[PDB]
Structures are given as structure tokens and as C-alpha cells.
């Protein structure tokens, strides 16, 4: 137990994947679909309304106009009324 044989140095065994990978951990590209055609969406953009069923609530960090997750949509009859008494319908 005094000695520690089999030092087993690791050099190119970790370089073999690439050198910038051992300084920066790289990024994950999304999966490409077919019905989506060629619109390569990323993981930090959403310009359409989503559905909030058993999903997570997204967060925003700066600028970059985004869509939303619809929680309630309803149509009723538009009653006549303003912020006052002027209610002419002639």
C-alpha cells in the first residue's frame, strides 16, 4: 500500500475529442425535423403561442420579443361602454 503502481497517465486520451472541448464545454444543437422544413429553431427563441398543460413556465433575461403560453382564451359579446357617459350609438 505504500507504493502506487500503474500511474496510468491520461494525455491524448482526452484530447482525442478536440482541444477546444477541454477549455469550453461546447453547446447542444437542437434536433432537426422534416415537417418543420428548414426553420432551425434554437433553445432560446419562441415567436408563437404555446400551450400551458403540464409544462414549465419559461423565463426571460433580456430584450428579445417572445411569444407566451396561453392560459385562458374566450370570446363574448362586446358590450357598449367607455370610461364615461358618452354612449351614443347613432
Amino acid at each position: 500500500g505504500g507504493m502506487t503502481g500503474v500511474l496510468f497517465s491520461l494525455g491524448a486520451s482526452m484530447v482525442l475529442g478536440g482541444v477546444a472541448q477541454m477549455l469550453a464545454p461546447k453547446a447542444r444543437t437542437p434536433r432537426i425535423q422534416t415537417t418543420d422544413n428548414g426553420k432551425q429553431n434554437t433553445y432560446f427563441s419562441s415567436l408563437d403561442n404555446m400551450v400551458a398543460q403540464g409544462n414549465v413556465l419559461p423565463v426571460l433575461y433580456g430584450e428579445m420579443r417572445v411569444g407566451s403560453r396561453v392560459v385562458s382564451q374566450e370570446i363574448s359579446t362586446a358590450d357598449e361602454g367607455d370610461g364615461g357617459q358618452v354612449v351614443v350609438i347613432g
Binding site: 400551458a52 398543460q53 403540464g54 409544462n55 414549465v56 413556465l57 419559461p58 423565463v59 403560453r69
Partner: peptide
Amino acid sequence: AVFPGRIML
């Protein structure tokens, strides 16, 4: 662990 801890119920 997952990042967006918020869950819609």
C-alpha cells in the same frame, strides 16, 4: 435536477 422548476398545474 431540471432548471425550470416552475410547473403548470
